[PDB]
Amino acid sequence: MYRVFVFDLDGTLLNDNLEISEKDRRNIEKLSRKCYVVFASGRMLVSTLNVEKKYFKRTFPTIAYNGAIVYLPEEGVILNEKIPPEVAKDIIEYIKPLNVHWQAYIDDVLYSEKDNEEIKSYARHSNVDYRVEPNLSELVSKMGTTKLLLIDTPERLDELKEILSERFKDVVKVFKSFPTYLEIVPKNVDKGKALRFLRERMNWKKEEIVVFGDNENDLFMFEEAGLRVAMENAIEKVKEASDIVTLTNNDSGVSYVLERISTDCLD
């Protein structure tokens, strides 16, 4: 039997309109009684906890920033991976002379040096609030950051990616999230390491854990679970590593399999 249920949000529990169907909501509600529910997302911690409170008036053990943050409703953040203020300072001092548009994620708040069109459109599309801080260099250099993000034309961004990777590949992870978004994040952090950490903390055993995913990012969690469910919309690689491929996230792919799994709770 299974007693721990891990769900990615985007492309999984959330449909393409970023909402959770009533069917999936009700099934989670039933499990949450007596059993453990875990949400794992690449989104900010606040954004993730907000979805939790919106559909369920509470919070659950949570994996945010794709593994950098592990949160427990009672303890709060018990894992907080970030770019060390040193490598962070080096990156900022290196990047500024290059006149680019960068923003920083600090203590769960998105900051941008200048209030331009780049930031406006990014916060809009990845729906999050941001704050303009001209002195962001000092904020980061002295407070540390979960991650940095550069926004430019796919052209210049492909070039920036090139030089920042060659220069910092050794102490940080640099990759394009999309044609116009370049991200810099803590080296070896991912959803799998975060889930394994949570497991050690909570004393979960792999055999009682189920994970639902659709991502390359979620593939890491699969190694830490006893049962693996890929969404029908998952990339080919994820489906081939799963045990079962349920319906799409636009339907209630989660419920479709969730209702058939051998589980404690619900008696």
Distance CA 143, CA 126 (A): 24
- CB crowding 28-44: b at 16 or more within 10 Å, else e: beebeeebbbbbbbbbb
Find out whether 251 is annotated in a ligand binding site.
Answer: no
Q: Nearest approach, Cβ of 98 to Mg ion (angstroms)? A: 32
Among 5, 11, 14, 258, binds Mg ion (CB under 5 A): 11
Distance CA 120, CA 138 (A): 22
Among 141, 215, 255, 263, binds Mg ion (CB under 5 A): 215
Q: Which CB atom, from 43 or from 92, has the smaller least distance to Mg ion?
A: 43
Strand partners for 11: none
Answer for the pair 242, 229: CB distance below 8 angstroms, yes or no.
yes
Q: Nearest approach, Cβ of 141 to Mg ion (angstroms)? A: 32
Find out whether 108 is annotated in a ligand binding site.
Answer: no
Residue whose entry in the numeric block shows the structure tokens 């044609």: 179
Interface with Mg ion includes 10 (CB under 5 A)? Answer: yes
Distance CA 46, CA 128 (A): 9
Q: Which CB atom, from 11 or from 192, has the smaller least distance to Mg ion?
A: 11
Q: Nearest approach, Cβ of 215 to Mg ion (angstroms)? A: 4
Q: Nearest approach, Cβ of 243 to Mg ion (angstroms)? A: 18
Q: Give the binding site for Mg ion (CB under 5 A).
A: 8, 10-11, 215
Residues annotated in a binding site for Mg(2+): 8, 10, 214, 218
